[PDB]
């Protein structure tokens, strides 16, 4: 995939350098995959300054390479990507440190720009001149902070395309490893997101904003609270024992911790009971869709590329082609196909 820096240079990474996207076109295809990278976030001046010292590619385009290799769902090889190998592929780097929510420029009062929500909008607008105008399906995908970003942005992309005069493009979401619980820690998270939203001028989807109201928009960063408010179809991929969830919960085995871990898996499974398109294996891991070996994991005998194909068919239950796949066994690696 080849790098393109945004033509509108007022849409910027944290340090004011232009944001951008990596593209590989497939001219025999009307499917478009736009993938949002992850990588945590920063929520005040001092924490963002630290990230600028040792995580600068997540804050700036000045050092980005001219190309990236497409892997997993972004691969063009059928053996690596049984699902969408012939699609047009787009990788959008995460350089806004705001869970893709921000709408604030650098200024005499702001050391950093937080423009994640505007970066997505501007990528979409510039791609319409490069072939996206002819699309039949636009899949907005993402991992980790990018998976939460899908939940925060998929309906805004759908509204953008309607208002621009493209009502026939079907917008859908794929959220990988971005479905978190605001639960009690094992030893003594929502404070940082509440502060972050104020620091970023962060924006959340309109229906969810109207439910929770002023001061409470942080709620919309949690999948089980924002998902019911969304109109676009969204497929949710989430490990039952996500490593980022456990890190924030201060988990690094006696009875108290055994019960804590079993209760976490049960709660996650409960939040997915009424999510009809979902894939949730009983593994300790983090991210999957752009890993080269994403084809290996299975739930109830069905792989993730197969489940996504069954989802495509359902949007035209299906015999032998399931779309809701959630493990019921209660401990990490009770599924034999978990990543080693
Ligand atoms: C460039 O982006 C900024 C910020 O979103 C916007 O206000 C401005 O209208 C854009 N310019 C053009 C020509 O689209
Ligand atoms: O990036 C991560 N972890 O992978 O956190 C993003 C985030 C923070 C708070 C609430 C939802 C999502
Ligand atoms: O609120 C909590 N639990 O204490 O975590 C929420 C969370 C978990 C994982 C990643 C981001 C945000």
mmCIF file of C-alpha atoms and ligand atoms in Angstrom:
data_model
loop_
_atom_site.group_PDB
_atom_site.id
_atom_site.type_symbol
_atom_site.label_atom_id
_atom_site.label_comp_id
_atom_site.label_asym_id
_atom_site.label_seq_id
_atom_site.Cartn_x
_atom_site.Cartn_y
_atom_site.Cartn_z
ATOM 1 C CA UNK A 1 0.000 0.000 0.000
ATOM 2 C CA UNK A 2 1.367 3.449 -0.989
ATOM 3 C CA UNK A 3 1.325 6.558 1.213
ATOM 4 C CA UNK A 4 -0.722 9.658 0.349
ATOM 5 C CA UNK A 5 -0.561 12.696 2.632
ATOM 6 C CA UNK A 6 -3.831 14.614 2.898
ATOM 7 C CA UNK A 7 -4.248 17.377 0.324
ATOM 8 C CA UNK A 8 -6.012 19.444 3.008
ATOM 9 C CA UNK A 9 -2.996 20.212 5.202
ATOM 10 C CA UNK A 10 -5.176 21.703 7.980
ATOM 11 C CA UNK A 11 -6.198 18.132 8.938
ATOM 12 C CA UNK A 12 -3.155 17.161 10.983
ATOM 13 C CA UNK A 13 -1.476 14.683 13.297
ATOM 14 C CA UNK A 14 -0.784 15.763 16.904
ATOM 15 C CA UNK A 15 2.269 17.892 16.020
ATOM 16 C CA UNK A 16 0.696 19.737 13.060
ATOM 17 C CA UNK A 17 2.221 17.577 10.319
ATOM 18 C CA UNK A 18 -0.266 16.340 7.669
ATOM 19 C CA UNK A 19 -2.244 13.167 8.336
ATOM 20 C CA UNK A 20 -2.624 10.597 5.567
ATOM 21 C CA UNK A 21 -3.530 7.112 4.345
ATOM 22 C CA UNK A 22 -1.930 4.120 2.582
ATOM 23 C CA UNK A 23 -3.774 2.801 -0.505
ATOM 24 C CA UNK A 24 -3.712 -0.218 -2.825
ATOM 25 C CA UNK A 25 -6.413 -0.049 -5.516
ATOM 26 C CA UNK A 26 -8.152 -3.098 -7.018
ATOM 27 C CA UNK A 27 -9.927 -1.797 -10.100
ATOM 28 C CA UNK A 28 -11.972 -4.962 -10.654
ATOM 29 C CA UNK A 29 -13.661 -4.547 -7.243
ATOM 30 C CA UNK A 30 -16.374 -2.317 -5.799
ATOM 31 C CA UNK A 31 -15.490 -3.243 -2.181
ATOM 32 C CA UNK A 32 -13.456 -0.807 -0.050
ATOM 33 C CA UNK A 33 -11.809 -1.645 3.302
ATOM 34 C CA UNK A 34 -10.687 1.329 5.457
ATOM 35 C CA UNK A 35 -8.689 0.155 8.505
ATOM 36 C CA UNK A 36 -8.064 2.298 11.630
ATOM 37 C CA UNK A 37 -4.789 1.597 13.481
ATOM 38 C CA UNK A 38 -4.699 1.506 17.293
ATOM 39 C CA UNK A 39 -2.178 2.356 20.020
ATOM 40 C CA UNK A 40 -3.609 3.653 23.360
ATOM 41 C CA UNK A 41 -4.020 7.476 23.752
ATOM 42 C CA UNK A 42 -2.776 10.457 25.777
ATOM 43 C CA UNK A 43 -4.889 12.722 27.966
ATOM 44 C CA UNK A 44 -2.888 15.753 29.216
ATOM 45 C CA UNK A 45 0.178 17.835 28.338
ATOM 46 C CA UNK A 46 2.680 15.845 30.395
ATOM 47 C CA UNK A 47 1.449 12.425 29.254
ATOM 48 C CA UNK A 48 1.354 13.551 25.601
ATOM 49 C CA UNK A 49 4.891 14.987 25.854
ATOM 50 C CA UNK A 50 6.116 11.578 27.077
ATOM 51 C CA UNK A 51 4.411 9.845 24.127
ATOM 52 C CA UNK A 52 6.054 12.333 21.726
ATOM 53 C CA UNK A 53 9.510 11.259 22.948
ATOM 54 C CA UNK A 54 9.196 7.493 22.469
ATOM 55 C CA UNK A 55 6.003 6.881 20.393
ATOM 56 C CA UNK A 56 6.405 9.671 17.837
ATOM 57 C CA UNK A 57 5.091 7.818 14.760
ATOM 58 C CA UNK A 58 1.744 7.788 16.648
ATOM 59 C CA UNK A 59 1.877 11.614 16.886
ATOM 60 C CA UNK A 60 3.479 12.759 13.590
ATOM 61 C CA UNK A 61 3.882 11.855 9.900
ATOM 62 C CA UNK A 62 7.421 13.283 9.589
ATOM 63 C CA UNK A 63 9.034 9.803 9.780
ATOM 64 C CA UNK A 64 6.423 7.623 8.016
ATOM 65 C CA UNK A 65 7.627 5.216 5.304
ATOM 66 C CA UNK A 66 6.448 5.467 1.707
ATOM 67 C CA UNK A 67 4.897 1.968 1.736
ATOM 68 C CA UNK A 68 3.351 -0.605 4.073
ATOM 69 C CA UNK A 69 2.763 -4.322 3.535
ATOM 70 C CA UNK A 70 -0.879 -5.399 3.719
ATOM 71 C CA UNK A 71 -1.368 -8.258 6.198
ATOM 72 C CA UNK A 72 -4.330 -10.327 7.381
ATOM 73 C CA UNK A 73 -7.595 -8.713 6.246
ATOM 74 C CA UNK A 74 -5.448 -6.165 4.313
ATOM 75 C CA UNK A 75 -3.643 -8.904 2.329
ATOM 76 C CA UNK A 76 -4.372 -9.338 -1.392
ATOM 77 C CA UNK A 77 -3.419 -13.068 -1.403
ATOM 78 C CA UNK A 78 -6.354 -15.536 -1.180
ATOM 79 C CA UNK A 79 -4.375 -17.936 1.009
ATOM 80 C CA UNK A 80 -3.819 -15.180 3.594
ATOM 81 C CA UNK A 81 -7.210 -13.428 3.223
ATOM 82 C CA UNK A 82 -10.069 -15.788 2.285
ATOM 83 C CA UNK A 83 -12.610 -13.024 3.034
ATOM 84 C CA UNK A 84 -11.813 -9.894 0.985
ATOM 85 C CA UNK A 85 -8.525 -10.541 -0.908
ATOM 86 C CA UNK A 86 -9.730 -8.687 -4.055
ATOM 87 C CA UNK A 87 -10.909 -5.496 -2.265
ATOM 88 C CA UNK A 88 -9.456 -1.987 -2.459
ATOM 89 C CA UNK A 89 -7.263 -1.706 0.676
ATOM 90 C CA UNK A 90 -6.715 1.386 2.875
ATOM 91 C CA UNK A 91 -4.622 1.654 6.085
ATOM 92 C CA UNK A 92 -5.204 4.905 8.031
ATOM 93 C CA UNK A 93 -2.370 5.552 10.537
ATOM 94 C CA UNK A 94 -3.310 6.609 14.088
ATOM 95 C CA UNK A 95 -1.511 9.915 14.728
ATOM 96 C CA UNK A 96 -4.127 11.757 16.851
ATOM 97 C CA UNK A 97 -3.860 9.958 20.264
ATOM 98 C CA UNK A 98 -7.611 10.528 20.879
ATOM 99 C CA UNK A 99 -9.301 7.135 20.180
ATOM 100 C CA UNK A 100 -10.333 8.682 16.811
ATOM 101 C CA UNK A 101 -12.728 11.110 18.592
ATOM 102 C CA UNK A 102 -11.033 14.503 18.382
ATOM 103 C CA UNK A 103 -12.035 17.706 16.618
ATOM 104 C CA UNK A 104 -9.524 20.318 17.857
ATOM 105 C CA UNK A 105 -6.721 22.116 15.989
ATOM 106 C CA UNK A 106 -3.351 23.243 17.311
ATOM 107 C CA UNK A 107 -3.448 26.947 18.223
ATOM 108 C CA UNK A 108 -1.924 29.494 20.575
ATOM 109 C CA UNK A 109 -3.935 27.776 23.353
ATOM 110 C CA UNK A 110 -3.358 24.114 22.305
ATOM 111 C CA UNK A 111 0.109 22.551 22.070
ATOM 112 C CA UNK A 112 -1.266 19.543 20.148
ATOM 113 C CA UNK A 113 -3.992 18.943 17.569
ATOM 114 C CA UNK A 114 -6.530 16.157 18.223
ATOM 115 C CA UNK A 115 -8.299 15.587 14.888
ATOM 116 C CA UNK A 116 -9.106 11.836 14.671
ATOM 117 C CA UNK A 117 -12.786 12.298 13.758
ATOM 118 C CA UNK A 118 -11.877 14.860 11.067
ATOM 119 C CA UNK A 119 -9.053 12.673 9.693
ATOM 120 C CA UNK A 120 -11.581 9.919 8.929
ATOM 121 C CA UNK A 121 -13.926 12.411 7.206
ATOM 122 C CA UNK A 122 -11.111 13.849 5.067
ATOM 123 C CA UNK A 123 -9.770 10.433 4.015
ATOM 124 C CA UNK A 124 -13.280 9.503 2.843
ATOM 125 C CA UNK A 125 -13.648 12.743 0.870
ATOM 126 C CA UNK A 126 -10.286 12.414 -0.891
ATOM 127 C CA UNK A 127 -10.876 8.735 -1.764
ATOM 128 C CA UNK A 128 -14.146 9.556 -3.556
ATOM 129 C CA UNK A 129 -12.032 10.997 -6.387
ATOM 130 C CA UNK A 130 -9.800 7.888 -6.515
ATOM 131 C CA UNK A 131 -12.580 5.329 -7.114
ATOM 132 C CA UNK A 132 -14.621 5.234 -3.878
ATOM 133 C CA UNK A 133 -17.470 7.006 -5.723
ATOM 134 C CA UNK A 134 -18.169 3.703 -7.504
ATOM 135 C CA UNK A 135 -18.242 1.512 -4.378
ATOM 136 C CA UNK A 136 -21.022 -0.858 -3.350
ATOM 137 C CA UNK A 137 -19.713 -1.523 0.214
ATOM 138 C CA UNK A 138 -17.424 0.534 2.478
ATOM 139 C CA UNK A 139 -16.225 -1.532 5.479
ATOM 140 C CA UNK A 140 -14.767 0.680 8.241
ATOM 141 C CA UNK A 141 -12.552 -1.657 10.314
ATOM 142 C CA UNK A 142 -10.070 -1.158 13.166
ATOM 143 C CA UNK A 143 -8.136 -2.828 15.996
ATOM 144 C CA UNK A 144 -7.806 -1.783 19.689
ATOM 145 C CA UNK A 145 -8.232 2.025 19.900
ATOM 146 C CA UNK A 146 -9.117 1.719 16.192
ATOM 147 C CA UNK A 147 -11.877 -0.759 17.019
ATOM 148 C CA UNK A 148 -13.387 1.723 19.468
ATOM 149 C CA UNK A 149 -12.905 4.325 16.712
ATOM 150 C CA UNK A 150 -15.154 2.257 14.399
ATOM 151 C CA UNK A 151 -17.945 2.363 16.980
ATOM 152 C CA UNK A 152 -17.504 6.139 17.373
ATOM 153 C CA UNK A 153 -17.346 6.942 13.620
ATOM 154 C CA UNK A 154 -19.252 4.414 11.426
ATOM 155 C CA UNK A 155 -22.604 6.265 11.549
ATOM 156 C CA UNK A 156 -20.899 9.603 10.820
ATOM 157 C CA UNK A 157 -19.312 8.130 7.663
ATOM 158 C CA UNK A 158 -22.744 6.854 6.582
ATOM 159 C CA UNK A 159 -24.265 10.317 7.133
ATOM 160 C CA UNK A 160 -21.364 11.996 5.292
ATOM 161 C CA UNK A 161 -21.875 9.843 2.198
ATOM 162 C CA UNK A 162 -25.647 10.408 2.229
ATOM 163 C CA UNK A 163 -25.216 14.192 2.462
ATOM 164 C CA UNK A 164 -22.616 14.205 -0.337
ATOM 165 C CA UNK A 165 -25.055 12.442 -2.677
ATOM 166 C CA UNK A 166 -23.924 8.779 -2.517
ATOM 167 C CA UNK A 167 -26.885 7.010 -0.841
ATOM 168 C CA UNK A 168 -26.138 3.670 -2.599
ATOM 169 C CA UNK A 169 -22.794 2.974 -0.867
ATOM 170 C CA UNK A 170 -23.499 0.582 2.030
ATOM 171 C CA UNK A 171 -21.436 1.574 5.090
ATOM 172 C CA UNK A 172 -20.647 -1.157 7.659
ATOM 173 C CA UNK A 173 -18.289 -1.543 10.631
ATOM 174 C CA UNK A 174 -15.840 -4.187 11.897
ATOM 175 C CA UNK A 175 -14.648 -3.470 15.481
ATOM 176 C CA UNK A 176 -11.720 -5.696 16.638
ATOM 177 C CA UNK A 177 -10.510 -5.649 20.286
ATOM 178 C CA UNK A 178 -12.228 -2.352 21.119
ATOM 179 C CA UNK A 179 -15.173 -3.613 23.270
ATOM 180 C CA UNK A 180 -14.251 -2.886 26.917
ATOM 181 C CA UNK A 181 -15.968 -3.044 30.323
ATOM 182 C CA UNK A 182 -15.936 -0.216 32.892
ATOM 183 C CA UNK A 183 -15.637 -2.809 35.664
ATOM 184 C CA UNK A 184 -14.102 -2.968 39.131
ATOM 185 C CA UNK A 185 -10.349 -3.580 39.131
ATOM 186 C CA UNK A 186 -8.780 -6.664 40.724
ATOM 187 C CA UNK A 187 -6.437 -4.359 42.683
ATOM 188 C CA UNK A 188 -6.768 -0.600 43.058
ATOM 189 C CA UNK A 189 -9.715 4.102 33.791
ATOM 190 C CA UNK A 190 -12.907 6.097 33.254
ATOM 191 C CA UNK A 191 -11.227 9.135 34.853
ATOM 192 C CA UNK A 192 -8.603 9.264 32.087
ATOM 193 C CA UNK A 193 -11.234 9.083 29.323
ATOM 194 C CA UNK A 194 -13.344 11.795 30.967
ATOM 195 C CA UNK A 195 -10.291 14.075 31.138
ATOM 196 C CA UNK A 196 -9.236 13.079 27.620
ATOM 197 C CA UNK A 197 -12.567 14.029 26.023
ATOM 198 C CA UNK A 198 -12.287 17.532 27.475
ATOM 199 C CA UNK A 199 -8.631 17.851 26.365
ATOM 200 C CA UNK A 200 -9.406 16.648 22.796
ATOM 201 C CA UNK A 201 -12.788 18.322 22.238
ATOM 202 C CA UNK A 202 -13.838 14.734 21.597
ATOM 203 C CA UNK A 203 -17.099 13.899 19.814
ATOM 204 C CA UNK A 204 -19.352 10.836 20.180
ATOM 205 C CA UNK A 205 -22.302 9.577 18.051
ATOM 206 C CA UNK A 206 -25.396 11.775 18.249
ATOM 207 C CA UNK A 207 -27.987 9.305 19.587
ATOM 208 C CA UNK A 208 -25.604 8.119 22.319
ATOM 209 C CA UNK A 209 -24.742 11.727 23.206
ATOM 210 C CA UNK A 210 -28.465 12.519 23.579
ATOM 211 C CA UNK A 211 -28.997 9.556 25.938
ATOM 212 C CA UNK A 212 -26.138 10.301 28.354
ATOM 213 C CA UNK A 213 -26.095 14.145 28.044
ATOM 214 C CA UNK A 214 -23.494 16.744 29.009
ATOM 215 C CA UNK A 215 -20.598 15.626 31.185
ATOM 216 C CA UNK A 216 -21.394 11.949 30.559
ATOM 217 C CA UNK A 217 -20.191 11.410 26.964
ATOM 218 C CA UNK A 218 -17.395 9.108 28.252
ATOM 219 C CA UNK A 219 -20.082 6.397 28.455
ATOM 220 C CA UNK A 220 -20.172 6.233 24.646
ATOM 221 C CA UNK A 221 -16.583 4.902 24.537
ATOM 222 C CA UNK A 222 -17.856 1.586 25.998
ATOM 223 C CA UNK A 223 -19.163 -0.807 23.352
ATOM 224 C CA UNK A 224 -22.084 -2.265 25.305
ATOM 225 C CA UNK A 225 -23.450 1.311 25.783
ATOM 226 C CA UNK A 226 -22.809 2.831 22.305
ATOM 227 C CA UNK A 227 -23.594 -0.242 20.119
ATOM 228 C CA UNK A 228 -27.398 -0.283 20.774
ATOM 229 C CA UNK A 229 -27.610 3.327 19.484
ATOM 230 C CA UNK A 230 -25.968 2.613 16.086
ATOM 231 C CA UNK A 231 -27.829 2.248 12.782
ATOM 232 C CA UNK A 232 -25.046 0.865 10.553
ATOM 233 C CA UNK A 233 -24.386 -2.907 10.676
ATOM 234 C CA UNK A 234 -21.371 -3.618 12.943
ATOM 235 C CA UNK A 235 -19.553 -6.953 13.419
ATOM 236 C CA UNK A 236 -17.815 -7.196 16.836
ATOM 237 C CA UNK A 237 -14.621 -9.255 17.336
ATOM 238 C CA UNK A 238 -13.538 -9.476 20.993
ATOM 239 C CA UNK A 239 -11.390 -11.925 22.952
ATOM 240 C CA UNK A 240 -13.173 -12.838 26.194
ATOM 241 C CA UNK A 241 -9.919 -12.260 28.165
ATOM 242 C CA UNK A 242 -8.475 -9.237 26.368
ATOM 243 C CA UNK A 243 -4.946 -8.346 27.515
ATOM 244 C CA UNK A 244 -5.638 -4.590 27.487
ATOM 245 C CA UNK A 245 -8.723 -5.170 29.653
ATOM 246 C CA UNK A 246 -6.671 -7.232 32.129
ATOM 247 C CA UNK A 247 -3.843 -4.648 32.246
ATOM 248 C CA UNK A 248 -6.228 -1.833 33.181
ATOM 249 C CA UNK A 249 -7.854 -4.212 35.704
ATOM 250 C CA UNK A 250 -4.393 -4.704 37.329
ATOM 251 C CA UNK A 251 -4.231 -8.450 36.573
ATOM 252 C CA UNK A 252 -0.798 -9.890 35.767
ATOM 253 C CA UNK A 253 -3.908 -18.863 40.627
ATOM 254 C CA UNK A 254 -5.784 -18.639 43.918
ATOM 255 C CA UNK A 255 -9.535 -18.488 44.491
ATOM 256 C CA UNK A 256 -10.014 -14.705 44.459
ATOM 257 C CA UNK A 257 -8.293 -14.237 41.100
ATOM 258 C CA UNK A 258 -9.939 -17.355 39.630
ATOM 259 C CA UNK A 259 -13.391 -15.946 40.427
ATOM 260 C CA UNK A 260 -12.349 -12.505 39.105
ATOM 261 C CA UNK A 261 -11.254 -13.955 35.743
ATOM 262 C CA UNK A 262 -14.309 -16.216 35.393
ATOM 263 C CA UNK A 263 -16.650 -13.301 36.193
ATOM 264 C CA UNK A 264 -14.931 -11.108 33.570
ATOM 265 C CA UNK A 265 -15.496 -13.694 30.830
ATOM 266 C CA UNK A 266 -19.125 -14.169 31.914
ATOM 267 C CA UNK A 267 -19.786 -10.412 31.848
ATOM 268 C CA UNK A 268 -18.234 -10.000 28.388
ATOM 269 C CA UNK A 269 -20.261 -12.948 27.071
ATOM 270 C CA UNK A 270 -23.409 -11.361 28.557
ATOM 271 C CA UNK A 271 -22.799 -8.018 26.772
ATOM 272 C CA UNK A 272 -22.608 -9.876 23.428
ATOM 273 C CA UNK A 273 -25.759 -11.996 23.860
ATOM 274 C CA UNK A 274 -27.832 -9.627 21.683
ATOM 275 C CA UNK A 275 -25.096 -8.722 19.157
ATOM 276 C CA UNK A 276 -26.072 -10.839 16.115
ATOM 277 C CA UNK A 277 -22.733 -10.440 14.227
ATOM 278 C CA UNK A 278 -19.902 -11.284 16.639
ATOM 279 C CA UNK A 279 -16.835 -13.533 17.145
ATOM 280 C CA UNK A 280 -15.623 -13.910 20.742
ATOM 281 C CA UNK A 281 -13.153 -16.707 21.574
ATOM 282 C CA UNK A 282 -12.116 -17.769 25.083
ATOM 283 C CA UNK A 283 -8.465 -16.714 24.768
ATOM 284 C CA UNK A 284 -5.983 -14.363 26.423
ATOM 285 C CA UNK A 285 -4.840 -12.193 23.475
ATOM 286 C CA UNK A 286 -5.140 -8.716 21.910
ATOM 287 C CA UNK A 287 -6.013 -7.802 18.275
ATOM 288 C CA UNK A 288 -6.443 -10.188 15.346
ATOM 289 C CA UNK A 289 -7.697 -8.863 12.011
ATOM 290 C CA UNK A 290 -4.359 -7.640 10.540
ATOM 291 C CA UNK A 291 -2.301 -10.558 11.909
ATOM 292 C CA UNK A 292 -1.069 -12.917 9.196
ATOM 293 C CA UNK A 293 -2.323 -15.979 11.111
ATOM 294 C CA UNK A 294 -5.819 -14.543 11.698
ATOM 295 C CA UNK A 295 -7.164 -17.524 9.700
ATOM 296 C CA UNK A 296 -6.281 -20.016 12.454
ATOM 297 C CA UNK A 297 -8.711 -19.319 15.308
ATOM 298 C CA UNK A 298 -12.152 -20.950 15.334
ATOM 299 C CA UNK A 299 -15.276 -20.826 17.503
ATOM 300 C CA UNK A 300 -17.637 -23.815 17.298
ATOM 301 C CA UNK A 301 -15.632 -24.981 14.260
ATOM 302 C CA UNK A 302 -15.977 -21.709 12.268
ATOM 303 C CA UNK A 303 -13.039 -19.407 11.442
ATOM 304 C CA UNK A 304 -13.203 -15.596 11.515
ATOM 305 C CA UNK A 305 -12.874 -15.170 7.699
ATOM 306 C CA UNK A 306 -15.776 -17.629 7.311
ATOM 307 C CA UNK A 307 -17.930 -15.767 9.856
ATOM 308 C CA UNK A 308 -17.312 -12.488 7.993
ATOM 309 C CA UNK A 309 -18.277 -14.140 4.688
ATOM 310 C CA UNK A 310 -21.493 -15.415 6.321
ATOM 311 C CA UNK A 311 -22.138 -11.835 7.505
ATOM 312 C CA UNK A 312 -21.811 -10.599 3.898
ATOM 313 C CA UNK A 313 -24.383 -13.190 2.770
ATOM 314 C CA UNK A 314 -26.767 -12.228 5.597
ATOM 315 C CA UNK A 315 -26.757 -8.583 4.426
ATOM 316 C CA UNK A 316 -27.943 -9.499 0.908
ATOM 317 C CA UNK A 317 -30.305 -17.682 9.498
ATOM 318 C CA UNK A 318 -28.132 -19.502 6.963
ATOM 319 C CA UNK A 319 -27.597 -23.272 6.960
ATOM 320 C CA UNK A 320 -24.015 -24.008 7.989
ATOM 321 C CA UNK A 321 -22.952 -20.325 7.799
ATOM 322 C CA UNK A 322 -23.189 -18.747 11.279
ATOM 323 C CA UNK A 323 -22.575 -15.105 12.165
ATOM 324 C CA UNK A 324 -22.948 -15.117 16.016
ATOM 325 C CA UNK A 325 -20.033 -17.112 17.519
ATOM 326 C CA UNK A 326 -19.350 -16.679 21.261
ATOM 327 C CA UNK A 327 -17.429 -19.242 23.355
ATOM 328 C CA UNK A 328 -19.202 -20.624 26.444
ATOM 329 C CA UNK A 329 -16.230 -22.231 28.181
ATOM 330 C CA UNK A 330 -15.056 -20.153 31.142
ATOM 331 C CA UNK A 331 -11.178 -20.056 31.237
ATOM 332 C CA UNK A 332 -8.460 -18.705 28.886
ATOM 333 C CA UNK A 333 -7.369 -21.357 26.333
ATOM 334 C CA UNK A 334 -10.365 -23.643 26.905
ATOM 335 C CA UNK A 335 -10.685 -23.144 23.127
ATOM 336 C CA UNK A 336 -7.920 -25.297 21.548
ATOM 337 C CA UNK A 337 -7.442 -22.899 18.598
ATOM 338 C CA UNK A 338 -6.317 -19.906 20.696
ATOM 339 C CA UNK A 339 -3.091 -18.159 19.618
ATOM 340 C CA UNK A 340 -0.021 -19.712 21.222
HETATM 341 C C1 LIG B 1 -9.849 21.401 5.360
HETATM 342 O O1 LIG B 1 -10.155 20.852 6.657
HETATM 343 C C2 LIG B 1 -10.689 21.810 7.582
HETATM 344 C C3 LIG B 1 -10.840 21.102 8.908
HETATM 345 O O2 LIG B 1 -11.733 20.001 8.807
HETATM 346 C C4 LIG B 1 -12.002 22.361 7.037
HETATM 347 O O3 LIG B 1 -12.518 23.339 7.934
HETATM 348 C C5 LIG B 1 -11.774 22.976 5.663
HETATM 349 O O4 LIG B 1 -13.012 23.391 5.100
HETATM 350 C C6 LIG B 1 -11.120 21.964 4.727
HETATM 351 N N1 LIG B 1 -10.838 22.570 3.436
HETATM 352 C C7 LIG B 1 -11.337 22.103 2.284
HETATM 353 C C8 LIG B 1 -10.945 22.853 1.047
HETATM 354 O O5 LIG B 1 -12.071 21.120 2.245
HETATM 355 O O1 LIG B 2 -6.681 1.778 23.225
HETATM 356 C C1 LIG B 2 -7.225 1.299 24.165
HETATM 357 N N1 LIG B 2 -6.991 -0.086 24.545
HETATM 358 O O2 LIG B 2 -6.638 -1.039 23.572
HETATM 359 O O3 LIG B 2 -8.104 2.084 24.910
HETATM 360 C C2 LIG B 2 -9.006 2.818 24.128
HETATM 361 C C3 LIG B 2 -10.241 2.988 25.004
HETATM 362 C C4 LIG B 2 -10.122 3.639 26.219
HETATM 363 C C5 LIG B 2 -11.236 3.774 27.030
HETATM 364 C C6 LIG B 2 -12.461 3.276 26.631
HETATM 365 C C7 LIG B 2 -12.572 2.627 25.416
HETATM 366 C C8 LIG B 2 -11.462 2.471 24.606
HETATM 367 O O1 LIG B 3 -12.644 0.939 33.423
HETATM 368 C C1 LIG B 3 -11.986 -0.039 33.295
HETATM 369 N N1 LIG B 3 -11.804 -0.950 34.408
HETATM 370 O O2 LIG B 3 -11.256 -0.521 35.623
HETATM 371 O O3 LIG B 3 -11.371 -0.346 32.075
HETATM 372 C C2 LIG B 3 -11.938 0.221 30.926
HETATM 373 C C3 LIG B 3 -10.943 -0.062 29.801
HETATM 374 C C4 LIG B 3 -10.433 -1.336 29.666
HETATM 375 C C5 LIG B 3 -9.509 -1.620 28.675
HETATM 376 C C6 LIG B 3 -9.117 -0.630 27.790
HETATM 377 C C7 LIG B 3 -9.642 0.645 27.917
HETATM 378 C C8 LIG B 3 -10.550 0.930 28.923
#
